[PDB]
Amino acid sequence: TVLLEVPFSARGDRIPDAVAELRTREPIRKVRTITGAEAWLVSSYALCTQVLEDRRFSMKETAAAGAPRLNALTVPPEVVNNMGNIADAGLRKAVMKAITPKAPGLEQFLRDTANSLLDNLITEGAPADLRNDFADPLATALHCKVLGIPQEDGPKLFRSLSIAFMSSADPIPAAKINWDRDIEYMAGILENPNITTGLMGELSRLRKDPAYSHVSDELFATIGVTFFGAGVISTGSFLTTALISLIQRPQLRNLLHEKPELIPAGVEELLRINLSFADGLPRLATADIQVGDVLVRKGELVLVLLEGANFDPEHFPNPGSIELDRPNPTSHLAFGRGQHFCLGSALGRRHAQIGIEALLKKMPGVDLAVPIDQLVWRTRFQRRIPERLPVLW
Amino acid sequence: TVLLEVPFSARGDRIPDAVAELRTREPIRKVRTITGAEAWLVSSYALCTQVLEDRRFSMKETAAAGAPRLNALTVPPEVVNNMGNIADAGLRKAVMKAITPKAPGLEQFLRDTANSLLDNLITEGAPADLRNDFADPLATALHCKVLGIPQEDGPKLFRSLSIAFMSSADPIPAAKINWDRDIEYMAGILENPNITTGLMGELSRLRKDPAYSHVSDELFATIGVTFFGAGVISTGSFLTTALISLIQRPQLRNLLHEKPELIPAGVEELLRINLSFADGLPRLATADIQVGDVLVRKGELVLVLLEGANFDPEHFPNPGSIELDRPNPTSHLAFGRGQHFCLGSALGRRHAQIGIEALLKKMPGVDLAVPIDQLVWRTRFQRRIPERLPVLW
Ligand code: HEM
Ligand code: HEM
Prior knowledge:
The structure is a homodimer.
Chain A: H1 17-25, E1 28-32, E2 38-42, H2 45-52, E3 57-58, H3 82-88, H4 92-98, H5 106-124, E4 128-129, H6 131-147, H7 154-159, H8 161-164, H9 173-191, H10 198-207, H11 217-247, H12 250-258, H13 263-272, E5 281-285, E6 289-291, E7 294-296, E8 301-304, H14 306-310, H15 345-362, E9 367-368, E10 390-392
Parallel strand pairs in A: 2-8
Antiparallel strand pairs in A: 1-2, 3-5, 4-10, 5-8, 6-7, 9-10
Helix pairs in contact in A: 5-6, 5-15, 6-11, 9-10, 9-11, 11-15, 13-15
Bound molecules: protoporphyrin IX containing FE (2 copies).
PDB class: oxidoreductase
Assembly: dimeric
Organism of A, B: Mycobacterium tuberculosis H37Rv
């Protein structure tokens, strides 16, 4: 038999029984990635947190030439250290401030957008596709507003993402074509005097402030492309698979419909059980480091399996059940942990909360319109998502 | 180990090594379908032809209540015998005449449509998706013209197909919703005095002719829905995967570009090697019948594996190679054989020939824009297709 291959399944509606067997038997174990590289797959809550909280397991060094790879780069190697670059340019606080859901008018914009999308689906009649015609457009609209860019520019930027977020053994020529185009777009945005709000409006101002005169135009454009992509793919994908989890729990659907004040707790549990990340989070060891029964050697690749942590019964008893009264509800790793904890966590929560609130109000009878096994799961991608999500109501 | 399950792979770019091993060892053998039923999978050219040419292996009887099933019905059971119903209504010759590619102006329409689609892709710039933005729209436009219906009605009818042609273990609620809507649409077309050309224009006339006064309005509408769906899914899917086969053979691409008069021979070979049909063709035995070393019993399900026949080296030496000078070039089973031989075979050939001619003229440098393994193959569907086909040129 060959060395255990990752990822195990592209299906995002259920966790393989094998994850629990692996966590019990070998919570750090050797695997082969799609590139043919070896890696250590970490699958218990304790060991996942250990790796994520130890910066000697480096994100930046995953981009080093000659390293064992999970998958091919789809961005320039310097862009793997995007947040480090942002910090070094003195831009971290400004970026963080631009991406909070608390910005005036933003939540009402989200609600208005969700409700319009849903009204259009109701007008057209069932079946509706909740990914392509709800969750993804909601994510796209949100991120255009957050960035300060025209809504009509969203679709073309969105269309890069089915390739930009591939998880490929080999470099992807289309990724570079789209990256270079999208960078040119963001560079134009920075020069556009009409763009005065949101993240790009703020970066535009900082660009002309003496305190940032030696920050490169490349970095400013890169922030725009990377935040649009990461935010849109992450929120669209999470909301889509959260909707599946909800639709398959009619009792929970009914409870949240009846008591919408429980939606934040529900969304936190949907985050905990979410299978949106298709691969473990990669890190490269910069030292020899003991992780459980394994001495990881300098230069080795480590993969932090989020669902390994999040379904660990030692930390989350009855891990497969959505319980709205857990004593440790935000202690999941859906947003990572440590140095690279998700900058967009509050925005991600709000997108999902508002999307779900709107859907339950407009479509309280929502149900799948096809048997669950008929969903088509995207392969060799950094997220798990159904290509279409057909529903009726 | 469990009984061998079908289908073997949803990948449409390569035949599994296992097909040849099976044909050699056990050219009729027992398998389990997605419903849990047992079936006989037939995989040699000799045995596939035998089954297809013996009407005691019945298409109609596959719809019988209580039969072992390949997959769930997505149409009313009477619609499985659509061609029998057409014949009995005296409509077979008229339907055949309406779907030939030789109709005045049709081939020029195909060429004009292909060229417009391609010009739009060139204007937008690489990468382009040759399935969603070329092959499928070309198929849809063709079938609206063939039916005599407005081009602007094509997209909505097309959108039914990702569900109508599912290969599901269980009935699909959305299939019935879309079927009933599409039937209402075709019924309206038959009543619409503006619709005077194509298949629906002819059926409209025959409907009011005394020789067809006791043919049901249900049958007339059913012909419209079934011919649109079967034709669009079959041509769109075939052309898409033929384009992959061509793109992966730069020499052949160059030869057909240089000598376009060889395109018909090329398309015949692309048909022969095509993996578009995801499942064997189902038949139910109506008698005990010897097939190779197996006595198939009355009531048993038989699956005719088209690629089993078409890659059989006993009939097609060097079966995986496209050879434009074979002595038996149309003797493949891409269009079936016998009673249920494809009514649209000439139209299917023309769609593909014209699409390929246009693509090679406009995009002689066409190549995949992503590694081939990055294509996402649709699962649990009656065809094998990539969800997107990214190319550059
Ligand atoms: C529910 C939605 C989201 C989920 C589940 C999610 C998940 C994650 C995870 C797991 C990480 C850690 C990656 C690692 O440590 O290797 C991360 C980091 C990150 N997230 Fe999110 N994310 C979401 C939404 C967003 C949004 C809306 C944005 C911005 C608009 C965003 C921007 C980022 C960025 C820029 C990082 C990199 C942090 C770093 O490398 O230091 N995310 N996210
Ligand atoms: C390259 C394109 C096509 C391919 C590969 C294809 C393939 C096939 C195959 C394999 C069968 C036999 C099914 C069986 O025996 O169980 C068939 C039958 C059929 N085809 Fe096609 N087809 C194509 C295009 C079309 C088009 C354009 C139309 C109509 C516009 C069409 C209409 C039909 C119909 C109505 C049948 C049923 C015949 C019967 O049950 O007696 N097909 N096709």
